[PDB]
């Protein structure tokens, strides 16, 4: 029940306390709930079937740009806010 705003502020205090992993692990969880990981998995197969040389680098050349675009905008904004909010505690108020 409107738990969004609460969850944000809570995370922020936890990360300050030394719980630094909470950012990366929380990103991971949003990506799984939304299904991002499974999509990248399939997009990878698609690329491999197209060119069919098993090479990792060239296949990463096309999978990576697309992968960064497919992350749901809510996941990117909420996670990017957590990073930004945290960074402000490391660097001067500006």
């Amino acid at each position: 029940m409107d738990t969004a705003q609460l969850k944000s502020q809570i995370q922020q205090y936890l990360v300050e306390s030394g719980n630094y992993e909470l950012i990366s692990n929380e990103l991971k969880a949003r990506l799984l709930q939304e299904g991002w990981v499974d999509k990248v998995k399939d997009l990878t197969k698609s690329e491999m079937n197209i060119n069919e040389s098993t090479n990792f680098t060239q296949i990463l050349s096309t999978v990576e740009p697309k992968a960064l675009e497919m992350v749901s905008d809510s996941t990117r904004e909420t996670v990017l806010k957590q990073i930004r909010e945290f960074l402000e505690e490391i660097v001067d108020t500006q």
């Binding site: 990366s24 098993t54 990017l80 990073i83």
Partner: peptide, 27 residues
Amino acid sequence: STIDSISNGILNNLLTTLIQDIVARET
């Protein structure tokens, strides 16, 4: 540089680390 440019540097680092792991399995 900027606080937002560093913010984006972190998120990009986190995401492309994951992406790499997924691509490397190749399946």
